[PDB]
Amino acid sequence: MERAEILGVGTELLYGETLDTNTAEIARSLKPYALKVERTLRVADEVAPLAREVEEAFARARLVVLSGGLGPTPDDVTREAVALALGEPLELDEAVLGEIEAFFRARGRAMPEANRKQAMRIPSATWLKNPRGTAPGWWVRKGGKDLVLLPGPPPEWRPMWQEVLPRLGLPRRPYAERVLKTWGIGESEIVERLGPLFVREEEVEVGTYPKVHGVEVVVRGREDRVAELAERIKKKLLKEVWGEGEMTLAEAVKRRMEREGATLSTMESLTGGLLGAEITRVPGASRFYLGGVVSYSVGAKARFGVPQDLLSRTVSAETARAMAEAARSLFGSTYALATTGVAGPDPLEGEPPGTVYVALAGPTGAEVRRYRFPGDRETVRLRSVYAALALLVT
Amino acid sequence: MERAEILGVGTELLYGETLDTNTAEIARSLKPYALKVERTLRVADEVAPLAREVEEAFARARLVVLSGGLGPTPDDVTREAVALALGEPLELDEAVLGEIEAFFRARGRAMPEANRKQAMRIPSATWLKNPRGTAPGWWVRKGGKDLVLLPGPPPEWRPMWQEVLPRLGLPRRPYAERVLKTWGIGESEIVERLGPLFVREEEEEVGTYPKVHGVEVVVRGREDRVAELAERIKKKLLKEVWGEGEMTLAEAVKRRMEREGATLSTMESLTGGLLGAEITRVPGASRFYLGGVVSYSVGAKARFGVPQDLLSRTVSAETARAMAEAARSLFGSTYALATTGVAGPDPLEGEPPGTVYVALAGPTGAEVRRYRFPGDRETVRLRSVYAALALLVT
Ligand SMILES: Nc1ncnc2c1ncn2[C@@H]1O[C@H](COP(=O)(O)OP(=O)(O)OP(=O)(O)O)[C@@H](O)[C@H]1O
Ligand SMILES: Nc1ncnc2c1ncn2[C@@H]1O[C@H](COP(=O)(O)OP(=O)(O)OP(=O)(O)O)[C@@H](O)[C@H]1O
Ligand SMILES: [Mg+2]
Ligand code: NA
Ligand code: NA
């Protein structure tokens, strides 16, 4: 079985100033392919060391993938290094140069000269287009082998990689992942409900992963086994599974709103906007989402419809219902969501961090759910948002 | 300057099934020492591969630190591999085997037969006591070179490493690092601006790291050189620097509001709440942030005071200004921020994804800034949030 080598370029990665997720993500994406990954490197932004790593990786591998160091600064050296490692000169490509000048002209700026080095390639490199920045990628095919250069930021390289991967002509293996997402049920109760279906072999395995949007049950391994097995697991978890694969809670809400021809608004205290943020993450949200109020002070809550009588008692079911009713009547939406309670670090009104009420107000009346969430400030905020969305999809 | 290599061992670190923070925490602890860390590695639990990597590492390094693979399973193989790499045999240490039997008797159990291997050591190795788990570590001195084996889990290895590290006799140098956080200046421009101050020598180095919150400029190396080059660099870039070190934009905004005794509110369209969300990330936001609105429909935009004549050009500096001044009057706040623009993926009002206006209104007037962000929907939304916060800290 042939080897893939994966190097993430960046001095900041050595020290975790940025945590290297790229090498693991790229390794995860290679699972459907018969290549072995024996190691992954993080390498400093330095030519001679980087060139040596590349020279070695290339000699042993069917595929070498790199990330990072495709920028314009003296710390961007991946191209020089790869050129050194493969013993080819850098040549300026005038057409890509022009694409870079146009990118800057479009912003009413002059292209700084430094950028020229991004238009630079070796004779065996093909370009990988990067519409999301100035740093295009490389794809070198040489002696049966592939070497791909990718930009550091994920928002840049993910699409680039998606595009080039199938074309590499790597040998396939019938590997699958199925991710089933649940809400309102802990890991143990899941393992219990599954019983024997909770298998863990060389062929197929099943895991629980706790996440802020509920516990995921991940089935992986051989395609056919993942298929039969996940089918039975969804079966036995029919009540708690809200979605699969790339389905999110915000997207299940969008599909319910468009089915019903219904609208939504929000009123938020502890979440500070995050619940609006999360509804609007999904493209097409303006088809149903009218807007929201972040009522972060006592003046804001009164102004936008929460009774006076309730302003000194914000950690309460009564408050979360009043906020959801306030937003629904202000905006005129079919449905309205509200989040109130204690994020952390400090307790509030004699209640501890993680004490949260989420409310849904709709045509037939309001509902409130009390939660007691584990985690720090930002984790409690996150789980609150998902619990608010869950009032609509579970 | 001599090399330090750092290897994390475990197949699950390659795939990020477990997140490798060990190699980075080790690299950081090595800072006060005149060693160059050129790379960090993660390696599969496989004896022949790991051996070759230890061998290559040991050949080129003054220090080699391995993490993990010290358990009892057929997949814990670090000892064998070190053994093999250094051409020395594994020996049972009866005393350490005794300590391992005491560990299991303490829990009322017999030691399983697998745990035998945890007492193997090579002749060149002294023992490193693990008083929090079963596997002790090794310190190997040979050829004027050190090689340390450490357990995987951090509560085990951290006290072990902290103990052995000052004994290794590594050469010391006074280290510093300064982290300058800027907004509103591109990476190419930072280079040009800084000119000959963008040093990359052995003693001293200056690096740029793009983030969604702004380009970070990092100086690291010899202490006297770092303070000098950071103060001149900060002088060149004085307008664009909003924070140092751990500072986030939300925190800087917080510092300015408290400093002046001032309040803030927001009005958001394309960001959807993510501005309020980022502001309220920081404990004690309630002391200055009164709240905000998310004006995501045309009706909400009118309800909350975008002028009617602007409803068909929401993508404009005119509308941003008016959103800001409305939010201000609506909450009675000293200042207010607004965002408006095209998130993507679709154009709006004839303008392409990435076209964004942010605005700040205050007691002496308002100001607007326009951007053309190149990335996907989620990146545009996040760059916008930081673009707005930057208006208060320039
Ligand atoms: N391996 C990685 N894992 C996660 N994030 C990364 C990784 N590499 C880089 N990043 C993020 O992306 C930025 C990219 O840095 P780098 O300067 O290497 O990219 P580049 O290839 O030069 O491309 P660009 O000029 O497009 O940023 C880093 O500051 C970091 O925030
Ligand atoms: N590189 C790493 N970075 C951060 N955490 C790690 C790393 N490696 C391991 N861990 C943590 O500790 C565990 C490591 O298990 P591993 O088998 O590597 O340890 P070991 O040295 O064999 O000793 P033990 O038998 O006590 O696990 C992981 O499951 C994870 O919690
Ligand atoms: Mg770069
Ligand atoms: Na920040
Ligand atoms: Na807002």
Author numbering:
A (entry chain B), B (entry chain A): 1 to 394
Which sentences from the paper describe this structure?
Here we describe the determination of the crystal structure of CinA from T. thermophilus (TtCinA), which contains both the NMN deamidase and COG1058 domains and is therefore a bifunctional enzyme. In addition, we show that TtCinA adopts a three-domain structure, with a third, previously unidentified, KH-type domain between the NMN deamidase and COG1058 domains. We demonstrate that TtCinA adopts an asymmetric dimer and present structures with NCN, ADP-ribose, AMP, and ATP bound, which provide experimental validation for the modes of substrate binding proposed previously. We use these structures to propose models for both enzymatic activities and suggest that large scale movement of the COG1058 domains is linked to ADPR catalysis as well as providing a rationale for the usual asymmetric arrangement of the TtCinA dimer.
